[PDB]
Amino acid sequence: MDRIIQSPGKYIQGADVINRLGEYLKPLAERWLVVGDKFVLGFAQSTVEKSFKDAGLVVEIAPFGGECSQNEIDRLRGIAETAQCGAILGIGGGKTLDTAKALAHFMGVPVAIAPTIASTDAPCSALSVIYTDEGEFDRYLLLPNNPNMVIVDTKIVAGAPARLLAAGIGDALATWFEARACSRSGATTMAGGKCTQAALALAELCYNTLLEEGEKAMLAAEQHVVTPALERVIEANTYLSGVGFESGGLAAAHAVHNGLTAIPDAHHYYHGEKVAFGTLTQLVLENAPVEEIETVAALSHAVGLPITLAQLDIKEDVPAKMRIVAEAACAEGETIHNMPGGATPDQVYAALLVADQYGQRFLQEWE
Amino acid sequence: MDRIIQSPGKYIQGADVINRLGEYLKPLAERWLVVGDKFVLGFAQSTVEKSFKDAGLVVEIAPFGGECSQNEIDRLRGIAETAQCGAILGIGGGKTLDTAKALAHFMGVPVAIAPTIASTDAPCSALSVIYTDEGEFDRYLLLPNNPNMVIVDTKIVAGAPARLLAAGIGDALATWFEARACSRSGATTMAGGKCTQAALALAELCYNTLLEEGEKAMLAAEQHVVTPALERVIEANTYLSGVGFESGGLAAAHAVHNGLTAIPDAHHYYHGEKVAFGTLTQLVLENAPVEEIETVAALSHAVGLPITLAQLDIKEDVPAKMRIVAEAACAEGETIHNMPGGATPDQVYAALLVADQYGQRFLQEWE
Amino acid sequence: MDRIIQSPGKYIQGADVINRLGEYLKPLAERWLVVGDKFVLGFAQSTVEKSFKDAGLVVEIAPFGGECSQNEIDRLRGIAETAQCGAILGIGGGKTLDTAKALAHFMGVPVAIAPTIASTDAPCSALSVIYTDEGEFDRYLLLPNNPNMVIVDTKIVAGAPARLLAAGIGDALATWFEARACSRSGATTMAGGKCTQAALALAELCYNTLLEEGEKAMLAAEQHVVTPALERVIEANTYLSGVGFESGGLAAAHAVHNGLTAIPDAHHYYHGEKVAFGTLTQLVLENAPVEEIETVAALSHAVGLPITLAQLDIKEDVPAKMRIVAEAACAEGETIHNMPGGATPDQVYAALLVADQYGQRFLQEWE
Amino acid sequence: MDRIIQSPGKYIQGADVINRLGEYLKPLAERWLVVGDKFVLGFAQSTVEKSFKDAGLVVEIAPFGGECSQNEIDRLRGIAETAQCGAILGIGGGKTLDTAKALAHFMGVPVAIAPTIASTDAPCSALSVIYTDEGEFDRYLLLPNNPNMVIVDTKIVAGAPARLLAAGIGDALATWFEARACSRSGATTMAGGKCTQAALALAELCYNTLLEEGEKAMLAAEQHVVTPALERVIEANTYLSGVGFESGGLAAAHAVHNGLTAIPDAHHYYHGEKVAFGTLTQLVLENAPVEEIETVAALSHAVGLPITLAQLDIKEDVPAKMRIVAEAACAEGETIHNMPGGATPDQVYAALLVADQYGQRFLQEWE
Ligand SMILES: [Cl-]
Ligand SMILES: [Zn+2]
Ligand SMILES: [Zn+2]
Ligand SMILES: [Zn+2]
Ligand SMILES: [Zn+2]
Ligand SMILES: [Zn+2]
């Protein structure tokens, strides 16, 4: 099979980089649609407009409905054709960014993505998740290519709630272990081939960056300031983790995340916070060595990620609920089948309970 | 400053991947111009055509004149506009690929790049070098983005003379040392910012891939067969080295290469062969440890790359010529100024003579 | 002297392997006597019968008396002769399996052994422990060969009380230290020769498997689920430990176990729980380094095995009782004479008291 | 699936152990057929007769036709039924032993196997290779169980030509690399399951034994004397390698051996001599690190095994012949499909030529 790696065309990261959006985006189009929800436009709209003006570009700002629905994409398509936009610039969190990527696809124009948080590794990916106007799952829209540009303002991200950075860390912490599993098993990545040497290097670089920089970065995030450690974790949460997961492979950790949403208890927890426990479950499933499990559990704990089912508010019908999680994780077409032996629901069920036990014993020892 | 990494959107590599050109390219355009190297088309045109047809695409094959001149670009522009092509596919050596990238830029269409040799790391880069019809240098054409897709057929590459693989190795062997030098000095990369963690990991991965796989890969190249060592060295010569140099930084090795072209003696040697000696000169200039010089020298010699001036046919007015090489390498806007502390023409002159001296003594131990 | 290793002809292990007894045993005989106690036949008879039926085999269920006595073997010999059995299948715990192996010997037929717990390393051995009709130890019965097949259902073993897995770990934890002692001293194994390289490799693998997988396997055991760590400790408790002790050697640890049954206080503790303290006694006796004593004590404690006399309910009049244990351990024909240099009852006495002190100081250091 | 390891019931090796056949074999049967090569009986028949007689056993000597054909098995079956033999003892080389094992199977009696050379790992296996009277291949006879006893007289083996010990080393050297390959890919062993930990430990112990003991053992082999190093290599060549391959897995090395017999040039070379080059081919195919390739090539050369096609007298029309070898090695039901990711005939062809290059380069350097 072919070895494939895909990447956004340009990834840019720096403090106060929105001031420089105009010069960065000019080579792609002269007239831009700028999609942002009201909260994000609150602090950035002044700066976006100034940057485009000084650069000689025309901007047409369109406040974002808040949900990534086919209706909202169609709605913005109208405004954009009316204002004769040559590209879309999405700015904000995950759903606002997915909307920009889907819109720019249907219109056949380039897209720029400016995350205002580093809480998932979705931004750089060639994937948009579409919902109905009212918020239920609808379809996956796999896109022909990754965002043309990704611009991350590290000062904006430092301003966000620290819990969102740690959720991002939890998301990126799975990257290495799922890419490694797909390499061991010969699985196909979401880029359509086997692992390049490049993708595995970026996946492992992700994990080591979190080990070396996570706690230092959280200190900065809690103070809402920018230090070089925060810079590195943002790159790891965003570019490394994005290319890592998409061109390196997904496996049990994310299948387990999907299983955890198939029950209501953990609705109030972020994507990356569920993956955190998914990674620990995968380590039990593949029987990672004790030193590796402890390292992942310690790092997760150090940044506030859950390492037990109770810390995801799953406290009541635990056997019954884990049986649902396990069946969901092993559903047809789920990525847990990329694990080396494959995985049966009985096996995933076992890992779920054991990972939970392991986390409980860890919390009572380390404090 | 901002940290920037740029990449082609999708990099694909595999044996006989030419059979799959059609499916890989369909998501980009329905109508394709193929700028093709005459030797490549000689044996492959039927196969390219069948690949496009089976995918439901219409293709217009255009044999390439051999030089990347404004005349040749204009001539191909006509053919493409007549045939109403939405994208350009270059397939062949460096000049074919540079022509496809320039053509696609002037037309404002996506471009796909299919190297049939792995002798430089230019294919993935956002740069095209334009000449006059008779091969004299004319100008640089910096492109706003990297090729949309790069597709490398390893079986086609294995057919080329092994000297071309080794030239590629010499080109890629410099990557780590120049990106590392730029990181030490805070220099700006060709992507316009400081180096990301990602680019440095790919640059160092490149170097280690060459150390571990170069001699094994050369064995396969000399038999024109495909082994996993060859696959990895092709990825290093192409994706790792391209992203490494462009987003990691250039320094003395390439500057010394340019200086070596300021004299006639080594005109008949490939780019990567002159870079090979540039890397040894940089190692003297930055006073790399002796183990490191020895490792780079041993690997270079093991794959037939020059490690002395005489092996580039520089045998006569060596001081006078090295004086020219040094002055040229230190010209304004040359990348030697990215070395920590910079480099004066007197310092580069000394490094040249000492590296040559070091290479000669290494050869005398018949290694 | 000759180097000899003995092994069962086939060892099979898996989840729900009970379903596959028929196809696994078909090549050995067509008509099978199945020996099982009422409790085991309770949950397993239905499944065994279906497995034999579907495979084209004849089964004869023979409920087991509960004691491995000469008279009980003779009784089953009669039942077997009547039903014209070509093979024996024992399926309960230890006494069931010993009875099946001896019966098959006197009958001159193959035997398959299906343990439903992994709590001792006897299953694979060419040995049956014989009692009187009223339950007193009578003699060891050496068999000419090891069981023809051993089939371990990992799901059945996961269902059993976790305390039994820990006893199995305690039993298997001694294997490396006693085989290593016999190798150092040149002692003869129960297989009749000196150590093969093979048996020493399997004994040390056993120890390292417990070291790496013991705590992970106990988490799965306490939840009655199957994880790859549990799979590994089952193989270690059963095959590795079995071939290790029989073809690797016994020494002080088992001598001390036998001595510990020469007093009533520890009647309520399993074989492996007493062996666990025997291993610590041997480590004091052979003056292992403190790192080795501590590693064994920590692993023992981490899975709930005793590392003090008090944890074997030996709390009253300890000096007098240890004298009896020591004298018993040094009886004629005991394996403590395999220690390098032998051991006197005074020496074993001192080792017992000091090992007890060591365990106590360890428990006082906060678990 | 299931973890399965199969083994002979008892493996014995020692100097002059044929003196002790009687006491070792008596517990299995009272009346023995001894199948023996005329040359082997030449020096051994008197000693065998005394050993069985002194032990109270009855023996019936049956000189062996030399070929393991159904006609010859039937001829010996007759003699055995007439003399009312309860078990078979084969004593000689490979054909004698395969004949004894098949005969014992058809008769449903135990078999004892006494190799007089240690040149393959077949003796301990549950497999017999049947030919026609005139030496052309007929069928494989998979046996329900491994030999009951294997007895290796190390002094008899020391008397054999040293080339045969080296052939045994070449055969045993592949064990680790093929078992490791099957473990990486989850292939099924010839024992019907996935790898036990035990079998991988024996396969790796085999490899390390050859590295540490191979050259010392060859010194003793050339003087026809017994040293502890020779004993360890015999155990490695016989028990470790046998259990390793059958319960650990076969892969490219043996597929490549089979392909090499598909051409006439190497008819005068022993099984293990061809396997030696098969291992090197596998190392190229799976892209083993150079240190590993060099270690295997160096050890192979140190004991006289071939590391080039010319050393197997394959010197003419080499590409044409290697294409035959490659196609044969990938035929349906060959073990090359156990390699991670499989291997196509083109990939094996490439490995063959490159491994040949590597061997040639090694011979002219490290001679
Ligand atoms: Cl035309
Ligand atoms: Zn995620
Ligand atoms: Zn270059
Ligand atoms: Zn050049
Ligand atoms: Zn025991
Ligand atoms: Zn073999």
In the set C98, C254, C301, C356, the catalytic residue is C254
Taking the CA of residue D298 and the nearest CA in chain A, the distance in Å comes to 29
| Interatomic CA distance for residues B88 and B109, integer angstroms | 7
> Angle at the Cα of A96 (from A91 to A98), degrees rounded to 5?
105
- Pairs of CB atoms within 8 A across B/D: 41
Residue whose C-alpha is closest to residue B128's, from B109, B110, B147, B153: B147
Instruction: Indicate the residue among C131, C159, C187 that finishes a domain.
Output: C159
> Angle at the Cα of D347 (from D345 to D352), degrees rounded to 5?
90
| Interatomic CA distance for residues B111 and C119, integer angstroms | 67
Domain residues for the domain of A272 are 160-367
Do D192 and D340 share a structural domain? yes
Angle between helices A94-106 and A70-83 (to 10 degrees): 60
* Burial (CB count <10 Å: 0-12, 13-18, 19+), residue A344: middle
Do A224 and A113 share a structural domain? no
Do A139 and A172 share a structural domain? no
Q: Taking CB atoms and an 8 Å cutoff, what residues of chain A touch D184?
A: 184
Classified as helix, coil or strand, C306 is coil
Taking the CA of residue B42 and the nearest CA in chain D, the distance in Å comes to 23
Residue whose C-alpha is closest to residue A35's, from A23, A24, A48: A48
How much distance in Å is there from the Cα of B329 to the middle of ligand 2?
A: 47
DSSP string, C2-34: -EEEE--SEEEEETTGGGGHHHHHTTT-SEEEE
What does chain C come to in residues? 367
Q: Taking CB atoms and an 8 Å cutoff, what residues of chain D touch B15?
A: 346
* Residues C304 and C163: beta-carbon distance below 8 Å: yes
Neighbour count for residue C7 (Cβ, 10 Å): 32
| Interatomic CA distance for residues A275 and A280, integer angstroms | 9
Looking at residue A286, its amino acid is E
- How distant, in Å, are the alpha carbons of C18, C39, C96, C238 from that of C116? 10, 11, 10, 11
DSSP string, C128-182: EEEE-TTS-EEEEEE-SS--SEEEEEHHHHHHS-HHHHHHHHHHHHHHHHHHHHH
Half-sphere exposure of C351 (CA within 13 A, CB side): 29
Instruction: Indicate the residue among C106, C126, C159 that finishes a domain.
Output: C159
DSSP string, A149-161: EEEEEHHHHHHS-
* Residues B97 and B70: beta-carbon distance below 8 Å: no
Residue whose C-alpha is closest to residue B240's, from B8, B3, B21: B8
Resolution in A: 2.8
Interface mutation target, options A7, A233, A235, chain B, most CBs of B under 10 Å: A7
Q: Taking CB atoms and an 8 Å cutoff, what residues of chain D touch C27?
A: 144-145
Do A167 and A51 share a structural domain? no
Contact residues for B240 (Cβ-Cβ < 8 A; gap 6+): A197, A198, B172, B175, B202, B203, B205, B206, B209
* Count of domains for chain A: 2
| Interatomic CA distance for residues B289 and B152, integer angstroms | 36
- How distant, in Å, are the alpha carbons of A145, B189, D162, D288 from that of D305? 53, 53, 12, 20
Do B165 and B118 share a structural domain? no
Contact residues for B136 (Cβ-Cβ < 8 A; gap 6+): none
D37 annotated ligand-binding residue? yes
Active site (catalytic) residues of B? 171, 254, 257, 271
Looking at residue D336, its amino acid is I
Active site (catalytic) residues of D? 171, 254, 257, 271
Q: Please give the structure tokens belonging to residue B306.
A: 């020059």
* Residues D316 and D249: beta-carbon distance below 8 Å: no
Q: Which residue has tokens 């059609």?
A: B22
D153 annotated ligand-binding residue? no
Method by which this entry was solved: X-ray
| Interatomic CA distance for residues A255 and A233, integer angstroms | 24
Angle between helices D252-261 and D318-329 (to 10 degrees): 130
| Interatomic CA distance for residues C195 and C193, integer angstroms | 7
- How distant, in Å, are the alpha carbons of A208, C202, C238, C359 from that of C235? 34, 11, 5, 28
Angle between helices A345-365 and C197-222 (to 10 degrees): 80
How much distance in Å is there from the Cα of B61 to the middle of ligand 1?
A: 8
Active site includes A171?
yes
> Angle at the Cα of D155 (from D149 to D161), degrees rounded to 5?
105
* Residues C192 and C1: beta-carbon distance below 8 Å: no
Q: Please give the structure tokens belonging to residue D49.
A: 């007769």
Do B164 and B151 share a structural domain? no
Q: Please give the structure tokens belonging to residue B51.
A: 């690949």
Can you say how many angstroms the Cα of residue B296 is from the centroid of all Cα atoms in its chain? Answer: 18
Q: How far apart are the first and last CA of chain C?
A: 46
Do D334 and D218 share a structural domain? yes
Q: Which residue has tokens 């030193």?
A: A291
Do D164 and D99 share a structural domain? no
How much distance in Å is there from the Cα of B234 to the middle of ligand 3?
A: 15
* Residues A34 and A169: beta-carbon distance below 8 Å: no
Contact residues for A283 (Cβ-Cβ < 8 A; gap 6+): A177, A292, A293, A296, A355
Ligand nearest to the CA of B169: 3
| Interatomic CA distance for residues B365 and B367, integer angstroms | 5
Can you name the residues that pair with A60 across neighbouring β-strands?
Answer: A33
Any D CB within 8 A of C13 CB: yes
CB contact under 8 A, A341 and D184: no
Any B CB within 8 A of D349 CB: yes
Looking at residue B162, its amino acid is A
Q: Taking CB atoms and an 8 Å cutoff, what residues of chain B touch D350?
A: 220, 223, 225-227
Can you say how many angstroms the Cα of residue A242 is from the centroid of all Cα atoms in its chain? Answer: 7
| Interatomic CA distance for residues B302 and B323, integer angstroms | 29
List the single residue in D with minimal CA-CA distance to B209: D289
Q: Which residue has tokens 């990992």?
A: C154
How much distance in Å is there from the Cα of B229 to the middle of ligand 3?
A: 22
Chain D stretch 93-132, residues whose beta carbon is closer than 8 A to a beta carbon of chain C: none
Contact residues for D146 (Cβ-Cβ < 8 A; gap 6+): C9, D6, D7, D8, D9, D124, D125, D126
Looking at residue C201, its amino acid is A
Max CA distance (Å), chain B = 62
| Interatomic CA distance for residues C220 and C215, integer angstroms | 9
The strands making up D149-153's β-sheet, listed across from edge to edge, are C3-6, D10-14, D149-153, D111-115, D87-92, D31-36, D58-63
Beta-strand pair A10-14/A149-153: parallel
- How distant, in Å, are the alpha carbons of C2, D158, D161, D234, D263 from that of D224? 19, 5, 8, 13, 34
* Residues A175 and A242: beta-carbon distance below 8 Å: no
Contacting partners of chain B (3+ CB pairs under 8 A): A, D
Q: Please give the structure tokens belonging to residue D318.
A: 């080499």
Q: Residue D101 belongs to a domain with what CATH number? A: 3.40.50.1970
List the single residue in D with minimal CA-CA distance to B231: D287
- How distant, in Å, are the alpha carbons of A1, A293, C73, C91, C243 from that of C99? 55, 43, 6, 10, 20
Strands, E assignment, C17-132: 31-36, 58-63, 87-90, 111-113, 127-131
Q: What are phi and psi of D86, to 5 degrees?
A: -95, -10
Neighbour count for residue C147 (Cβ, 10 Å): 29
Can you name the residues that pair with D130 across neighbouring β-strands?
Answer: D139
Do D319 and D171 share a structural domain? yes
A94 annotated ligand-binding residue? yes
Do A308 and A257 share a structural domain? yes
Any A CB within 8 A of B136 CB: no
Classified as helix, coil or strand, D153 is strand
- Give the 3-state DSSP-derived string for chain B, with helices as H, strands as E and coil as C: CCEEEECCCEEEEECCHHHHHHHHHCCCCCEEEEEECHHHHHHHHHHHHHHHHHCCCEEEEEECCCCCEHHHHHHHHHHHHHCCCCEEEEEECHHHHHHHHHHHHHHCCCEEEEECCCCCCCCCCCEEEEECCCCCEEEEEECCCCCCEEEEEHHHHHHCCHHHHHHHHHHHHHHHHHHHHHHHHCCCCCCCCECCHHHHHHHHHHHHHHHHHHHHHHHHHHHCCCCHHHHHHHHHHHHHHHHHHHHHCCCHHHHHHHHHHCCCCCCCCCHHHHHHHHHHHHHHHCCCCHHHHHHHHHHHHHCCCCCCCHHHCCCCCHHHHHHHHHHHHCCCCCHHHHCCCCCCHHHHHHHHHHHHHHHHHHHHCCC
Taking the CA of residue C20 and the nearest CA in chain D, the distance in Å comes to 10
Q: Which residues have beta carbons under 5 A from ligand 3 (an ion)? A: B 171
How much distance in Å is there from the Cα of D315 to the middle of ligand 6?
A: 24
Q: Please give the structure tokens belonging to residue B230.
A: 């060859």
Do C229 and C95 share a structural domain? no
Do D242 and D146 share a structural domain? no
| Interatomic CA distance for residues D183 and D179, integer angstroms | 6
Residue whose C-alpha is closest to residue C351's, from C297, C261, C279: C279
Q: Where are the alpha helices (DSSP H) in A107-161?
A: 154-159
Residue whose C-alpha is closest to residue D305's, from D228, D253, D240: D253
Q: Taking CB atoms and an 8 Å cutoff, what residues of chain D touch B14?
A: none
Q: What are phi and psi of D304, to 5 degrees?
A: 90, 5
> Angle at the Cα of B107 (from B103 to B109), degrees rounded to 5?
95
| Interatomic CA distance for residues D80 and B66, integer angstroms | 83
How much distance in Å is there from the Cα of A232 to the middle of ligand 3?
A: 28
Residue whose C-alpha is closest to residue B165's, from B97, B255, B227, B96: B227
How much distance in Å is there from the Cα of A276 to the middle of ligand 2?
A: 10
Any D CB within 8 A of C240 CB: yes
Residue whose C-alpha is closest to residue D206's, from D245, D181, D174, D241: D241
- How distant, in Å, are the alpha carbons of C73, C94, C132, C239 from that of C136? 16, 15, 5, 28
| Interatomic CA distance for residues C293 and C285, integer angstroms | 11
Q: Where are the alpha helices (DSSP H) in C186-302?
A: 197-222, 228-235, 241-248, 252-261, 271-285, 290-302
* Residues A38 and A70: beta-carbon distance below 8 Å: no
DSSP string, A161-198: -HHHHHHHHHHHHHHHHHHHHHHHHTPPPTTSSBPPHH
Chains C and D touch (3+ CB pairs under 8 A): yes
| Interatomic CA distance for residues A214 and A229, integer angstroms | 8
* Residues A244 and A206: beta-carbon distance below 8 Å: yes
Beta-strand pair B111-115/B149-153: parallel
Residue whose C-alpha is closest to residue A246's, from A348, A147, A170, A167: A147
* Residues A226 and A238: beta-carbon distance below 8 Å: no
Classified as helix, coil or strand, C110 is coil
CB contact under 8 A, A354 and C212: no
CB contact under 8 A, A7 and B9: yes
Contact residues for A359 (Cβ-Cβ < 8 A; gap 6+): A277, A280, A297, A306, A307, A308, A309, A311
A9, A205, A240 member nearest B146 (Cβ): A9
Neighbour count for residue A125 (Cβ, 10 Å): 25
Q: Residue A363 belongs to a domain with what CATH number? A: 1.20.1090.10
* Residues A114 and A89: beta-carbon distance below 8 Å: yes
Taking the CA of residue B58 and the nearest CA in chain A, the distance in Å comes to 19
| Interatomic CA distance for residues B17 and B234, integer angstroms | 14
* Residues B277 and B298: beta-carbon distance below 8 Å: no
DSSP string, D296-345: HHHHHHHTT---SSGGGT--SSHHHHHHHHHHHHTSTT-GGGGSTT---H
Q: Please give the structure tokens belonging to residue A208.
A: 């080591």
Instruction: Indicate the residue among C109, C144, C159 that finishes a domain.
Output: C159
Classified as helix, coil or strand, C118 is coil
Contact residues for A208 (Cβ-Cβ < 8 A; gap 6+): none
